[PDB]
Amino acid sequence: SVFLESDLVTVGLAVDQIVGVDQRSENFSVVGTLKLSWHDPKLGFSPDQCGCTVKSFEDASIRAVAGEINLPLPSFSFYNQQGNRWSQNQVIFVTPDGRASYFERFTVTLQAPDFDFLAYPFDRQKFSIKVDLAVPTNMFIFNEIERFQQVVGDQLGEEEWVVTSYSQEITEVPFERGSTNSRFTTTLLVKRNLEYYILRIFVPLFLIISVSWV
Amino acid sequence: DTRYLTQHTRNLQPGDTFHALVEPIGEAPLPRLRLTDSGGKPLAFGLIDQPGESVELNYTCDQDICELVVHVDGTDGQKDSGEAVYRLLVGINAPNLSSVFLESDLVTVGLAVDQIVGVDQRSENFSVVGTLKLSWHDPKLGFSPDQCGCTVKSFEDASIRAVAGEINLPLPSFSFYNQQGNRWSQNQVIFVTPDGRASYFERFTVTLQAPDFDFLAYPFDRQKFSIKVDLAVPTNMFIFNEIERFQQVVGDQLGEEEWVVTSYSQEITEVPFERGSTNSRFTTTLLVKRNLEYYILRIFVPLFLIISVSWVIFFLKDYGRQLEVASGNLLVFVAFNFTISGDLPRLGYLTVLDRFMIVSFCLTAIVVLISVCQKRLGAVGKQAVAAQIDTWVLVIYPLVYSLYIIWVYLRFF
Known part of the structure; x- marks a missing residue:
């Protein structure tokens, strides 16, 4: 068994809806879910007090009442993120073992500064x-990605773009001076539906230039 | 998906017995049965019986109070066994092969829409106001009405989520x-009786996704x-098990004029979350059809009029003027066409109206292609030839007119 005692953040994320995709402002909006999990021998929930294996908490209770012992939280x-994150449920479960599992379903607006409009x-x-x-x-640190459900939902609900491939991957980033924090970069690569563009822009063009020919 | 099971039992009194049995009703492989306390600590083994098809299990309460949880282990079995059935026989005092001895906590969900505020087309979302009621018996939170000169006490949001979580018993x-964005919750009030019957309803405003928007039929x-x-x-x-219609699902006065509801659907499902874990889903679905009374009087009536003009010009046969008129009628068409506004998001497909419209425009220009031809003839000569085709077209034009309609009827219906 492993004698460097570990506290290690397991991050999972999943997109379930692409609500909005702005072009001018170069942002876009998605609904999703984000799950963090980590062993703490602390918060050791002996199930003698509770006739149960698992107890849970939501937002105001966790950030306040879990900060009652003043042990740290990730x-x-x-x-x-641009603007606000519309958090629907921020619920967090714990085992006697002391296995933390926090997931949060969310609504977000995100920046896309790598919009190349040239290929348009x-x-x-x-x-x-x-x-x-x-x-x-x-x-x-997050070290291991768990795919707690499929990253790209079957029913995203957007018709101008569709996703080609996804990417989930961890990096470590400088903060302050000489300090590093993990970054769970979760990247969709996307291509544009041209069926609109072919039928309402391209054939008309062909027709009009055809007239000049004839 | 559900490859393991539990049942929280009733509180056994001191020195009271318990009997349990599993039997594969659907010729499925043999399961492991166990009894455990309310926590993890276990009490017994469901042994495989003399016959060799039944999982017999026994235990008697020695602690001050016994809180019991029967397990049915389903991991050594048929791989992805779509159907595996079992008959779970459980009882307290009689060893045999009135009231219900599996302790129940069961979520009763009711929902009702009362307004369809907004219906976006481009973004493919819509907004409703409603009410959602959850109810469930917990012998816990047992409100003895000696403290309160009353049968019922109630709580709103900040008090329930915080102060009801003071005992640290779980809540559904x-x-x-x-949901897209935020849920605009007006009152989140929750009632409880001494009995320990939880009553939570919440009036809300929501924006919801509709990824099942087919714009083709438009x-x-x-x-x-x-x-x-x-x-x-x-x-x-x-789990929600039973739907209560606490008021009518579709309100009389929804307050939307472009759509009206055809039929509703309320129905429970169970959905995978995490790994190997299932949660209930109360799917409450309105089916809707579009009011076309707008579409008939501001899109279709005019179209008919404009194409009628192309028809009636063939009557005239003063070919210069005929052509002038037809050309003019086509010119209007352009104006009209860009007038009709479709609020549809830019879309991969042509819809119905897009197809009829494109067929209208082009042959309307074909009526102009014909006026030219006739005028030319008339000028050089063979004026009767021009008149022949005039009659010829009038016959054929509105039938390809009609079959085209019947054509798309078929493909789009």
């Missing part, structure tokens, strides 16, 4: 969901 | 799956507006 931030309307793009820790890696 | 959380299109409401917790804790 904070996190959507780096390239034949253009591909990168939609990213970069999710850092707020705390440094003196405290917490 | 829930989420609108296909403007003759029907759609599905859904309100999928999951639990956040798994079914180790809570």
